[PDB]
Design an enzyme around this catalytic site. Structure first.
Site, PDB file in Angstrom:
ATOM      1  N   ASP A 131      -3.183  16.352  70.437  1.00 36.32           N
ATOM      2  CA  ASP A 131      -4.593  16.289  70.229  1.00 36.32           C
ATOM      3  C   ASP A 131      -5.175  15.320  70.858  1.00 36.32           C
ATOM      4  O   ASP A 131      -6.526  15.365  71.186  1.00 36.32           O
ATOM      5  CB  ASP A 131      -5.054  16.383  68.623  1.00 36.32           C
ATOM      6  CG  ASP A 131      -4.141  15.426  68.171  1.00 36.32           C
ATOM      7  OD1 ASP A 131      -3.405  14.597  68.471  1.00 36.32           O
ATOM      8  OD2 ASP A 131      -4.417  15.529  66.774  1.00 36.32           O
ATOM      9  N   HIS A 188      16.310  13.606  93.401  1.00 35.39           N
ATOM     10  CA  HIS A 188      16.449  13.888  94.876  1.00 35.39           C
ATOM     11  C   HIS A 188      18.003  13.412  95.137  1.00 35.39           C
ATOM     12  O   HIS A 188      18.318  14.048  96.080  1.00 35.39           O
ATOM     13  CB  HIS A 188      15.429  13.337  95.543  1.00 35.39           C
ATOM     14  CG  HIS A 188      14.107  13.769  95.217  1.00 35.39           C
ATOM     15  ND1 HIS A 188      13.603  14.918  95.810  1.00 35.39           N
ATOM     16  CD2 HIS A 188      12.966  13.067  94.711  1.00 35.39           C
ATOM     17  CE1 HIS A 188      12.301  14.866  95.534  1.00 35.39           C
ATOM     18  NE2 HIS A 188      11.882  13.758  94.726  1.00 35.39           N
ATOM     19  N   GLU A 221       9.028  24.508  97.864  1.00 32.03           N
ATOM     20  CA  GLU A 221       7.830  24.517  97.212  1.00 32.03           C
ATOM     21  C   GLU A 221       6.621  25.375  98.049  1.00 32.03           C
ATOM     22  O   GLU A 221       6.101  24.777  98.825  1.00 32.03           O
ATOM     23  CB  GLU A 221       7.362  23.237  97.036  1.00 32.03           C
ATOM     24  CG  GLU A 221       8.039  22.353  95.810  1.00 32.03           C
ATOM     25  CD  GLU A 221       8.952  21.524  96.436  1.00 32.03           C
ATOM     26  OE1 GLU A 221       9.197  21.353  97.608  1.00 32.03           O
ATOM     27  OE2 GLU A 221       9.509  20.676  95.485  1.00 32.03           O
ATOM     28  N   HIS A 228       1.773  12.520  63.059  1.00 34.78           N
ATOM     29  CA  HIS A 228       2.323  13.627  63.325  1.00 34.78           C
ATOM     30  C   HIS A 228       3.716  13.937  63.175  1.00 34.78           C
ATOM     31  O   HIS A 228       4.635  14.576  63.901  1.00 34.78           O
ATOM     32  CB  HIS A 228       2.116  14.724  64.785  1.00 34.78           C
ATOM     33  CG  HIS A 228       0.548  14.619  65.185  1.00 34.78           C
ATOM     34  ND1 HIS A 228      -0.119  15.670  64.644  1.00 34.78           N
ATOM     35  CD2 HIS A 228      -0.256  13.969  65.609  1.00 34.78           C
ATOM     36  CE1 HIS A 228      -1.388  15.733  65.083  1.00 34.78           C
ATOM     37  NE2 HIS A 228      -1.336  14.568  65.549  1.00 34.78           N
ATOM     38  N   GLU A 258      20.791  21.169 102.515  1.00 35.67           N
ATOM     39  CA  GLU A 258      20.167  22.159 101.821  1.00 35.67           C
ATOM     40  C   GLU A 258      18.658  22.035 101.830  1.00 35.67           C
ATOM     41  O   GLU A 258      18.146  20.886 101.726  1.00 35.67           O
ATOM     42  CB  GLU A 258      20.456  22.285 100.383  1.00 35.67           C
ATOM     43  CG  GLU A 258      20.100  23.462  99.421  1.00 35.67           C
ATOM     44  CD  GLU A 258      18.901  23.075  98.803  1.00 35.67           C
ATOM     45  OE1 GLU A 258      18.618  21.861  98.260  1.00 35.67           O
ATOM     46  OE2 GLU A 258      18.145  24.069  98.477  1.00 35.67           O
ATOM     47  N   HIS A 288      24.248  44.931  81.149  1.00 37.45           N
ATOM     48  CA  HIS A 288      24.612  45.053  82.560  1.00 37.45           C
ATOM     49  C   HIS A 288      25.449  46.324  82.653  1.00 37.45           C
ATOM     50  O   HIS A 288      26.517  46.448  82.148  1.00 37.45           O
ATOM     51  CB  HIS A 288      25.264  43.731  82.816  1.00 37.45           C
ATOM     52  CG  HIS A 288      24.483  42.394  82.640  1.00 37.45           C
ATOM     53  ND1 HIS A 288      23.271  42.220  83.366  1.00 37.45           N
ATOM     54  CD2 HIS A 288      24.560  41.690  81.661  1.00 37.45           C
ATOM     55  CE1 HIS A 288      22.622  40.967  82.852  1.00 37.45           C
ATOM     56  NE2 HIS A 288      23.403  40.812  81.727  1.00 37.45           N
ATOM     57  N   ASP A 299      19.540  16.593 101.320  1.00 32.36           N
ATOM     58  CA  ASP A 299      18.617  17.764 100.802  1.00 32.36           C
ATOM     59  C   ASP A 299      17.059  17.491 101.536  1.00 32.36           C
ATOM     60  O   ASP A 299      16.683  16.329 101.338  1.00 32.36           O
ATOM     61  CB  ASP A 299      18.347  18.167  99.392  1.00 32.36           C
ATOM     62  CG  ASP A 299      18.066  16.837  98.602  1.00 32.36           C
ATOM     63  OD1 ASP A 299      18.129  15.846  99.084  1.00 32.36           O
ATOM     64  OD2 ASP A 299      17.442  17.295  97.486  1.00 32.36           O
TER      65      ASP A 299
END
Lengths: 1359, 89
Positions: free
Chosen positions: A1319, A977, A763, A1288, A759, A834, A10
């Site tokens: 935060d 990748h 981006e 948290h 392929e 559909h 790719d």
RNA sequence: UAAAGAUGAGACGCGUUUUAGAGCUAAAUAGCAAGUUAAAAUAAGGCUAGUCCGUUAUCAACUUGAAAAAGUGGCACCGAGUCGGUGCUU
């Protein structure tokens, strides 16, 4: 176990990924070899991995610097010619003059001659400056007066006129066609009336000369110029163009309904690309407008510089400059008087301190004009008596200079006037100036054309110039040495872009006649008209298109829908009210050249004889290419008897720009064998099925695809990659991929792979710029309707990014299969329905999906529903159809209830949609690998194919992932990748094995066609040659096929062929195999090392200073005395091992250091390494112990802790987190609760799934804990996220998972950066120590990563 | 491609090569190497230096002005091992 | 839905460093006078010498002995925490 394997590849924008699979879909492992000084002679590795590099910029700053260097060279040559003439008589006047102008830059202590340049003795220098204050005083004293003058001052004025010479736009002489403002103004309004005939502009009582050339301000002149005109708005179009010509900044956004604002100013350095960006949004038909404002601006400013009338002197420009000098003097005296009197505590801060923007900041500091005016405007407003000065300051005419930025519009004929007068005066007092006059005027008025190029002899790859004799081209024998016919011939055969569909042809000019016949017959052929009794709105006939193109287009410039419905239908064809379906309120094609030459020739029969085409094409191309006068005159002599003298003198001021993209041989050169017609002949009359250009390319029934396909053959590799299009990062990826393919064939014993699968991902996303067009699109729908919905609930451009809400808006708040309305706060409880089921095609755009109340409204069958919404909502569908809310194709999808169920062409369009690749770059990449692999030749010279290179649609693999639960979280590591290379390699092989009659579609090769209409089942249970009924070609991976009506069926388990029957897909073992392969710790990662290239330092020139890091800027100009540059650039690094002096003892102890080598000092290093290092203060430097280290080197420390050398003093992290699949599935099912897009039942079972497995949070904190304790080695931030993890501990899943995916930017490969918790903002931690590196293994790797070589930097350092 | 210009691949090959010549020290092969940098920073194409005749014409023309005195034919045909080893067919 | 799309030729105008435009009056310093212009450089430079070329494309380490014959690095099993163990052959 096998020797026939496959390679998966790719290609991205900053990565290429590669994998080597065998027929049982494993990754084979091998022992590879290590050279160096280690006892590690072989290591095991797997055959899978990635490649990561950086993107490269464009070639524009290089070209700008290059042409700047050429112009500086040529100006120095002109001054050398002039001194070469005056040398002999100047030797009789004063020998040592040109040496005094040689070395006038240097400090006195390096001056051998005397230091005053002109005369040498000080009395004549002081007298010379007290008598002539500037250069222009001296030029006026030469032109007017009648004495005998000195030879040196004549040399200084002629040098000052030959060095700075003016622009060459106005060609000819100065006459009022192109010098007076009023004629240019009439040219502007005749251009404007030529564009907008509907609203004419009168200018009969307008004297633009008295108005636009007065001693007033700017805005007052714009108000007066409107206040002479009968009712124009000051912010319209025409007022904005006059405000463009004065030098004000309008906005044309309100005139064409743009999306952002656009400010234009002619005096700014980026006017050209901004004007070209504005002209890319409103068409290319608005060029003469924005040019004819600019020529008007040059006429205005040129009339503003010349404040001197004629009939007094021959030098207007010099008297204008002297007048400016005396006004400057007087106003300076007055300003010092007033500020001296009334504000006596500000007199020092304006007139001495050059750090403010005062007066001394304008003379000696660097502040421009504008900052000076904005500095002393209110300080003038605090006093009295400045009313005249405030008038001048608003007129922008206060305290000016002579060398300003307005002089870019003084033409060369004015300097040629002053030079010609000086030569005509003095030559009765010198004989050699009587001999040499045409010589010097030929030095000034010489300009190298466009069709000659640089004057090379063969050391340049940028030239094409051919000579006739063997001498030295000077300005005088240019027209005797340079052959110009052959030069122009190479200029044509170099400066024309080739045809992309068919090489060995050249493209057409955009303003030619034939190309615009092409685009007009392209626009007319797809229009439809609905009439009473014409319920299928048919196309036009042949004679109808002939009448429309011969009445509406060869008489009128533009045609809109009003004269379409009126001026032909209510004139000849005699109808009443005809619905016009297919044109958007006006046409878009035109005929410009026919009306332009129709204006010029003022004749009819020569345009319409149909035997005069190639004459006109030579005229049009001739006007397109050159911008020379004499060569147009040369190339039009052969057509002298066809035109009279005035029209022959009126063609030659006309030009065009721009190129199309079709050759002539494509349009009218080739035919179809079954037809015997050209493409334009199909566009004229086809009869039944009227098709456009894009449907005549890819028609399989014709000769066209085989002629173009067989005609693309296409020298080295960099010419192939160089001579095509694309953003150049993708070309970088192509080159790296070809290198990787050759080395994977090197490793595996030189057996050719059976399949290479490529392929190309994307981006390329810029903004939701089509979502502003979704808000504006809904404004088109409701501004078309005018109903009472947006008055209840308007739209905005933040909410509509959710697809449920946009698809909620696309039904106008009306439910579809139930005659009711829709509530705004029930987005989660409105069901998506559909029309065609999911088992036939997978279409997830706006086209397929419609909203409904409940999912049981359309009946119970899989096929089309009942026909009640057709009879109830037909006007609803009509005014949805006009308003562009539903498109033409989706309205053709809503009418499928009538035309007889489903047939062969629908399912053939489902498969045809889910096979055919249409983008134009993957085809050529496949031509590169196909041209490089298959070179086996047969006996009939046909195509032997051993390698199949295959490309796939980029949604199949994502469907495989989301179906079989191999999820992908992008923020964890870089192993995706290689996994995508693996899945490309698998899915392509299974899809080529299962269906043998699908090779002509997606295998690049000259293959024959098979009948799709016979290889499709015509029934449901029909099922061998009939492959399948359910048109989705990805169904057999499943176990249970699923309809959209309420039925779910099953399939067998072992998936084989029905013609031969070989095992191609199993269900039991393969998910454990593929699920095992994704779980390996070791996957190959290679960062691609680079060498730094570019400029030498920062490109600003610092003043003189006694530091020691200012680079010198000439060889004997010392930066303690002359100043220079600032801060160089490091190119690479070098390891050194040799002993230096200790101190005053000069003792010999060894070291081991790391050195930086700049770009300026790279040739001297590579010329002699030992000599350069031995001159840098070393001793006993060896040869084998010099190691070159570029950027991104790879050092291995203990326990598998790797680092990459980012610079000379900064390291980067280089390990990898290999996390099992269970945590990936848990984080992805945990965090993505926003974009679910699933039915709530099994997703509710997934909520039970996370509710059961809620302890993987603590396990992942353990994984990051031990991994950060092993290689990352950072303590305080890790304890900080442990305490912050404690504070948290009671939020739900849909935030804790979000801050764990935000936690994983602690352990990436790359740079140490910062991130955010709920935060707490966790700060970065950087490495600033390069000390541990020197006791580590240095690893050298090739491109793939397999072949390595280790160098142990721990032993080397002693003896 | 096959043209030898002022690249970065060419400069790394010539740096590899300029380490090598320190082994053979009883000859004089340094001056020919500095000359071949001389044609290559000035923009020429030195891709005709794969034939041993062309190197002999160039070293003879360079001997015309008096430079390269100490170079025989015995050193040169040694040195043409090296534009077929590093780069060159 | 596809389909600009990169690369190349000619010339202005400012911008920026040093020097020249005799600064004066009354140790540190204060008061005053003045100011626009010009010459040279515009990546350090290179040499089979052109009115040429110098910031983009391009780049793991080693290599003096016969080709789209060859440039330099054996193959199968059992495992899996950044890659191990064994067979055979060498």
């Amino acid at each position: 176990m096998d020797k026939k394997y496959s390679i998966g590849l790719d290609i991205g924008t900053n990565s290429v990924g590669w994998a080597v699979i065998t027929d049982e879909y494993k990754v084979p492992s091998k022992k590879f070899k290590v050279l160096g000084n280690t006892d590690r002679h072989s290591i095991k590795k797997n055959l899978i991995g990635a490649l990561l590099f950086d993107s490269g910029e464009t070639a524009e700053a290089t070209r700008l610097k290059r042409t700047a260097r050429r112009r500086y060279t040529r100006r120095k040559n002109r001054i050398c010619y002039l001194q070469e003439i005056f040398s002999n008589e100047m030797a009789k006047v004063d020998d040592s003059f040109f040496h005094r102008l040689e070395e006038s830059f240097l400090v006195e202590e390096d001056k051998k001659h005397e230091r005053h340049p002109i005369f040498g003795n000080i009395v004549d220098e002081v007298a010379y400056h007290e008598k002539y204050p500037t250069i222009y005083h001296l030029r006026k004293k030469l032109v007017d007066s009648t004495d005998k003058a000195d030879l040196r001052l004549i040399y200084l004025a002629l040098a000052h006129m030959i060095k700075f010479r003016g622009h060459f736009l106005i060609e000819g002489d100065l006459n009022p066609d192109n010098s007076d403002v009023d004629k240019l103004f009439i040219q502007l309004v005749q251009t404007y009336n030529q564009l907008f005939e509907e609203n004419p502009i009168n200018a009969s009582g307008v004297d633009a000369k008295a108005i636009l050339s007065a001693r007033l301000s700017k805005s007052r002149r714009l108000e007066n110029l409107i206040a002479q005109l009968p009712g124009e708005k000051k912010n319209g179009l025409f007022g904005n163009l006059i405000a463009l010509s004065l030098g004000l900044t309008p906005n044309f956004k309100s005139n064409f309904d743009l999306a952002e604002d656009a400010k234009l100013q002619l005096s700014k350095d980026t006017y050209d690309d901004d004007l070209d960006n504005l002209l890319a949004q409103i068409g290319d038909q608005y060029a003469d407008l924005f040019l004819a404002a600019k020529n008007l601006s040059d006429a205005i400013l040129l009339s503003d510089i010349l404040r001197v009338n004629t009939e007094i002197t021959k030098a207007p420009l010099s008297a204008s400059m002297i007048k400016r000098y005396d006004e400057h003097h007087q106003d300076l005296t007055l300003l010092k008087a007033l500020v001296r009197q009334q504000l006596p505590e500000k007199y020092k801060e304006i007139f001495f301190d050059q750090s403010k923007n005062g007066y001394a900041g304008y003379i000696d500091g660097g502040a421009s004009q504008e900052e000076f005016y904005k500095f002393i405007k209110p300080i003038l407003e605090k006093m009295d008596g400045t009313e005249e000065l405030l008038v001048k300051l608003n007129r922008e005419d206060l305290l000016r200079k002579q060398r300003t930025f307005d002089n870019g519009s003084i033409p060369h004929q004015i300097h040629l006037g002053e030079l010609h007068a000086i030569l005509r005066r003095q030559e009765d007092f010198y004989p050699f100036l009587k001999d040499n006059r045409e010589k010097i005027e030929k030095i000034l008025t010489f300009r190298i054309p466009y069709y000659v190029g640089p004057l090379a002899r063969g050391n340049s790859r940028f030239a094409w110039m051919t000579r006739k004799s063997e001498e030295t081209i000077t300005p005088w024998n240019f027209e005797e040495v340079v052959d110009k016919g052959a030069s122009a011939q190479s200029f044509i055969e170099r400066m024309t872009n080739f045809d992309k569909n068919l090489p060995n042809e050249k493209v057409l000019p955009k303003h030619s006649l034939l190309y615009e016949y092409f685009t007009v017959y392209n626009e007319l052929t797809k229009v439809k008209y609905v009439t009473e009794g014409m319920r299928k709105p048919a196309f036009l006939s042949g004679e109808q298109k002939k009448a429309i193109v011969d009445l509406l287009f060869k008489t009128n410039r533009k045609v809109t829908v009003k004269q379409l419905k009126e001026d032909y239908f209510k004139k000849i064809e005699c109808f009443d009210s005809v619905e016009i379906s297919g044109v958007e309120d006006r046409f878009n094609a035109s005929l410009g050249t026919y009306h332009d030459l129709l204006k010029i020739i003022k004749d009819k029969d020569f345009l319409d004889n149909e035997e005069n085409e190639d004459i006109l094409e030579d005229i049009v191309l001739t006007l397109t290419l050159f911008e020379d006068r004499e060569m147009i005159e040369e190339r039009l002599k052969t057509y002298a008897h066809l035109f009279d003298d005035k029209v022959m003198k009126q063609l030659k001021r006309r030009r065009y720009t721009g190129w199309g993209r079709l050759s002539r041989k494509l349009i009218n050169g080739i035919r179809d064998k079954q037809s015997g017609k050209t493409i334009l002949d199909f566009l004229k009359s086809d009869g039944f099925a009227n098709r456009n250009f894009m449907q005549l390319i890819h028609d399989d029934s014709l000769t066209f695809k085989e002629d173009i396909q067989k005609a693309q053959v296409s020298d080295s590799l960099h010419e192939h990659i160089a001579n095509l299009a694309g953003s150049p990062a993708i070309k970088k990826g192509i080159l790296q991929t070809v290198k990787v393919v050759d080395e994977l064939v090197k490793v595996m014993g030189r057996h050719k792979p059976e399949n290479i699968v490529i392929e190309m991902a994307r981006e390329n996303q810029t903004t939701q710029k089509n979502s502003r067009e979704r808000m504006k699109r809904i404004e088109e729908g409701i501004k078309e309707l005018g109903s009472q919905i947006l008055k209840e609930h308007p739209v905005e451009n933040t909410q509509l990014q959710n697809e449920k809400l946009y698809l909620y808006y696309l039904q106008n708040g009306r439910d579809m299969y139930v005659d009711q309305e829709l509530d705004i706060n029930r987005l989660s409880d409105y069901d998506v329905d559909h029309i065609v089921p999911q088992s036939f095609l997978k279409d997830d755009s706006i086209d397929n999906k419609v909203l409904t109340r409940s999912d049981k409204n359309r009946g119970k069958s899989d096929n089309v529903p009942s026909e009640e919404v057709v009879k109830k909502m037909k006007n609803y569908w009509r005014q949805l159809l006009n308003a562009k809310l539903i498109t033409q194709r989706k309205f053709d999808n809503l009418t499928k209830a009538e035309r007889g169920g489903l047939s062969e062409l629908d399912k053939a369009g489902f498969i045809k949609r889910q096979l055919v690749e249409t983008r134009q770059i993957t085809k050529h990449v496949a031509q590169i690998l196909d041209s490089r692999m298959n070179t086996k030749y047969d006996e009939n010279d046909k195509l032997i194919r051993e390698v199949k290179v295959i490309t796939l649609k980029s949604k199949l693999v994502s469907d495989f992932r989301k179906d079989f639960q191999f999820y992908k979280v992008r923020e964890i590591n870089n192993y995706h990748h290689a996994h995508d290379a693996y899945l490309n390699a698998v899915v392509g092989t299974a899809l080529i094995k299962k269906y043998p009659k699908l090779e002509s579609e997606f295998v690049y090769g000259d293959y024959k066609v098979y009948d799709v209409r016979k290889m499709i089942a015509k029934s449901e249970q029909e099922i061998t040659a009939k492959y399948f009924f359910y048109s989705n070609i990805m169904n057999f991976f499943k176990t249970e096929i699923t309809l959209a009506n309420g039925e779910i069926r099953k399939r067998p388990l072992i998936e084989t062929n029905g013609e031969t029957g070989e095992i191609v897909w199993d269900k039991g073992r393969d998910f454990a195999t593929v699920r095992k392969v994704l779980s390996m710790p070791q996957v190959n990662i290679v960062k691609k090392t680079e060498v730094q290239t570019g400029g030498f330092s920062k490109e600003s020139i610092l003043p003189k200073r006694n530091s020691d890091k200012l680079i010198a800027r000439k060889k004997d100009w010392d930066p303690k005395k002359y100043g220079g540059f600032d801060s160089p650039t490091v190119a690479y690094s070098v390891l050194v091992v040799a002993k230096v002096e200790k101190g005053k003892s000069k003792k010999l102890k060894s070291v081991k250091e790391l050195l930086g080598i700049t770009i300026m000092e790279r040739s001297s290093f590579e010329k002699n390494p030992i000599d350069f290092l031995e001159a840098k203060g070393y001793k006993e430097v060896k040869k084998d112990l010099i190691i070159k280290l570029p950027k991104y080197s790879l050092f291995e420390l203990e326990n598998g802790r790797k680092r990459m050398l980012a610079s000379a003093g900064e390291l980067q992290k280089g390990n990898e987190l290999a996390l099992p699949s269970k945590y990936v599935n848990f984080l992805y099912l945990a965090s993505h609760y926003e974009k679910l897009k699933g039915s709530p039942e099994d997703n509710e079972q997934k909520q039970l799934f996370v509710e059961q497995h809620k302890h993987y949070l603590d396990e992942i904190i353990e994984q990051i804990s031990e991994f950060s304790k092993r290689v990352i080695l950072a303590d305080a931030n890790l304890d900080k996220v442990l305490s912050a993890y404690n504070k948290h501990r009671d939020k739900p899943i849909r935030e804790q998972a979000e801050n764990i995916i935000h936690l994983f930017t602690l352990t990436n490969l790359g740079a140490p950066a910062a991130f955010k918790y709920f935060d707490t903002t966790i700060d970065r931690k950087r490495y600033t120590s390069t000390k541990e590196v020197l006791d580590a293994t240095l690893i050298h790797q090739s491109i793939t990563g397999l072949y390595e070589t280790r160098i142990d930097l721990s032993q080397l350092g002693g003896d | 491609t096959n043209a030898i210009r002022n690249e970065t691949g060419t400069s790394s090959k010539m740096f590899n090569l300029s380490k090598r010549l320190y082994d053979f020290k009883d000859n004089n092969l340094r001056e020919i190497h500095e000359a071949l940098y001389g044609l290559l920073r000035a923009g020429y194409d030195i891709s005709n230096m794969r034939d041993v005749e062309e190197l002999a014409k160039y070293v003879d023309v360079k001997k015309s002005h008096g430079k390269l005195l100490d170079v025989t034919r015995d050193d040169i045909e040694l040195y043409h091992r090296l534009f077929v080893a590093r780069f060159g067919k």
